[PDB]
From a paper:
Tailoring steps catalyzed by SAM methyltransferase-like proteins have yielded particular insight into evolution of anthracyclines and generation of structural diversity. DnrK is a canonical S-adenosyl-L-methionine (SAM)-dependent methyltransferase that catalyzes 4-O-methylation in daunorubicin biosynthesis. Recent studies have uncovered that DnrK is bifunctional and catalyzes additional 10-decarboxylation as a moonlighting activity. Here we have taken advantage of the natural diversity of anthracycline methyltransferases and employed extensive chimeragenesis to probe factors that govern catalysis and substrate recognition.
Next the chimeric pair DnrK RTTD and DnrK RTTR was constructed to examine the influence of the sugar-binding regions R2 and R3 from TamK, an enzyme with higher affinity towards 4 than RdmB. Both DnrK RTTD and DnrK RTTR became exceptional generalist enzymes, with the ability to use any of the substrates to catalyze reactions, yielding all potential products albeit at different yields. The presence of R1 from RdmB in both chimeras shifted the reactivity from 4-O-methylation towards 10-hydroxylation, with less than 15% of the native DnrK activity measured, compared to almost 60% 10-hydroxylation conversion. Structures of DnrK RTTD and DnrK RTTR in complex with 1 revealed the molecular basis for the expanded substrate specificity. Regions R2 and R3 are observed in a closer interaction with each other when compared with all structures in complex with 2, closing the active site to stabilize the smaller aglycone substrate. The mutations introduced by chimeragenesis have altered the hydrogen bonding network between the R2 and R3 interface. The α11 helix hosting R3 is extended by a single turn, which positions the helix in the space vacated by the absent carbohydrate unit. This structural change allows stabilization of the substrate via hydrogen bonding interactions between R163 and the 6-hydroxyl group of 1. As an example, DnrK RTTD and RTTR differ only in one amino acid, K190 and N190, respectively, that is located in R4. The same inter-region interaction (3.5 Å) may be observed in DnrK RTTD in complex with 1, but the hydrogen bond is not present in DnrK RTTR in complex with 1 due to the shorter side chain of N190 (5.6 Å).
Numbering used by the authors:
A (entry chain A): 15 to 285, 296 to 356
B (entry chain B): 6 to 162, 166 to 172, 181, 184 to 186, 231 to 234, 237 to 242, 244 to 275, 280 to 285, ...
């Protein structure tokens, strides 16, 4: 059982069988009628001999089942690869989309452990966010992926804070505007600014406009290593700082400290050890970032001239197998 | 607001485990760095292990976290990590040679990178190995003597072999005219080849006879077969496919065994 258990752990073919299936929209095509190999091969544009060899392992791991002879149907776990499923797992495993494409960086993990440095650029030619800035399909795909992680609703992180005395929110690296939008639905008196990159600002405005939230949340295109576009009572950093090594993280925290109004707060929204280490090693090979322990957080806070006032407890979100925290940061 | 449904979370966790590239690459990185050997040699602190492996200590520790999470390393004493029961199989002296199997510097774990382009293999039926490394699998080994050495040594667990009433006394391209013999042995050979190369090999064997093929949970049958797709364009084959191949070579199957089970197909001239 040890030799068997280690070979399953060490197996590279099972993950890429799952990822090949997601990229081919296999489960979509089955659910739309193509239950046999010959029909599925034509829908996916694959060699019929080759599909069957892929399907065999899909059956052997319990994502596919055989109902009638020759006819394949997804199981309960395999249904999560339907494109419309609310956890978006198909797109998370779609090698044409930005995250599963970034996971190829894991094939150079030894380099990342030897150096502490990301392996993405050594595969694709440019660092992560610079690659997206020249690949609008990947920029859009990454933004859509980050939004679905809270059912695009971000209800749990926005409930974890009291917005009574907050006039303006600046969502720094706020993505497509989901967190800003969630605060505005909860606190009708607050207005908000989303600071994001080229490409993402457009999809953020569309999303915010399509929420009827255009009158209350606006979107600025800029670089958060530079002076922030305005001041605010609540500055949001939501899955931003784990993208960055300690020195860049402090730089970002400092720009936010400079932009705080008197009495205002910086809010860090960030993080099953299997899933904790997945995100942490992703940050290594993608970007050179990391997850940080509470003690490391005090250290980074102090380098930016801030204190961790409190850490508001597990926020459970749908579609994410992993909880998160909200860190409230006070100027020292 | 949020609705958390445990049956769907359990299902989501299952699919993400199945789909994750980090667990296999963490095991392969550990095997490539000889982590378990170094631990067994008395390096239990992260600082020593990083020195022996020439990795940054912060990064090594994050690798260890996942090795702990998946059960290959137990923490035991604060800051001193030890192999578990499963972890001990990464020891270099272990007879299953799993460490050599997962070492990215050896031939097979290096070839396993071909799995990163599985869609190309499924779309086309052609191997992806030469698209990543530049040479088809065996051309690559012919120009890389340490990889030809690693593979030959992996397979025990041509001139580049010879440890020392036929099997293709010791004697040195079975695509060339082969001595003769009363039984020729093709053991885990023909799965390495497309159907036409397999027929060629079987043909030469037929021309020297006065033929037994030794080849084949399903997770391990599909691993070997999908490896043969992305590495070489070979495949595991069914009784029906073996008959069509025997016929193309002038032969007839006259199909006989206990991680993976094997079979014996004795072939006679038609
Ligand atoms: C561990 C059990 C076993 O060794 C059983 C069997 O012996 C076998 C395996 C692997 C390979 C070959 C085998 O024959 C093989 O022939 C081959 C080849 O010709 C050319 C390239 C790679 C391989 C290759 O990776 C192993 C397996 O099936 O699962 C890991
Ligand atoms: N230099 C920079 N200036 C502004 N935004 C940046 C930036 N570098 C990265 N970002 C943005 O930081 C974001 C991190 S992903 C986090 C998105 C969103 N806040 C959420 O929680 O879902 C990306 O969308 C990226 O565009
Ligand atoms: N054109 C060729 N002629 C002869 N041998 C070849 C070949 N191409 C590959 N091989 C060898 O065939 C082997 C398949 S694996 C070993 C097969 C079996 N154990 C045996 O004893 O023969 C590999 O070691 C590979 O080096």
């Amino acid at each position: 059982d040890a030799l068997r258990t280690l070979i399953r752990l060490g197996s590279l073919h099972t993950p890429m069988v799952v990822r090949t299936a997601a990229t081919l929209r296999l489960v979509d095509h089955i659910l739309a009628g193509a239950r046999t190999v010959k029909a599925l091969a034509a829908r996916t544009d694959t060699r019929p001999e080759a599909l069957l060899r892929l399907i065999r392992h899909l059956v052997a791991i319990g994502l596919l089942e055989e109902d009638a002879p020759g006819e394949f149907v997804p199981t309960e776990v395999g249904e999560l690869l339907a494109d419309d499923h609310p956890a978006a797992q198909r797109a998370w495993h779609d090698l044409t989309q930005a995250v599963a494409r970034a996971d190829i960086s894991f094939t150079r993990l030894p380099d990342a452990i030897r150096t502490g440095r990301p392996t993405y650029e050594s595969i694709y030619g440019k660092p992560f966010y610079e690659d997206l800035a020249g690949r609008p399909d990947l920029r859009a795909s990454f933004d859509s992926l980050m939004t679905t992680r809270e059912d695009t609703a971000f209800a749990a992180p926005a409930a974890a804070y009291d917005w009574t005395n907050v006039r303006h929110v600046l969502d720094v690296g706020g993505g497509n505007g989901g967190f800003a939008a969630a605060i505005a639905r909860r606190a009708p008196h607050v207005s908000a600014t989303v600071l994001e990159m080229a490409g993402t600002v457009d999809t953020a405005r569309s999303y915010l406009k399509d929420e009827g939230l255009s009158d209350r949340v606006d979107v600025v295109e800029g670089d958060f290593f530079e002076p922030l576009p305005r001041k605010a009572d609540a500055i949001i950093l939501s899955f931003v700082l784990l993208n960055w090594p300690d020195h860049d993280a402090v730089r970002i925290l400092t720009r936010c400290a400079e932009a705080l109004e008197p009495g205002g707060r910086i809010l860090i929204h960030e993080r099953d050890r299997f899933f904790s280490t997945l995100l942490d090693l992703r940050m290594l090979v993608f970007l050179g970032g990391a997850l940080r322990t509470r003690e490391k957080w005090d250290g980074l806070a102090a380098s930016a001239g801030l204190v961790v006032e409190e850490v508001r407890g597990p926020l459970v979100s749908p579609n994410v197998p992993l909880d998160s925290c909200l860190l409230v940061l006070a100027p020292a």
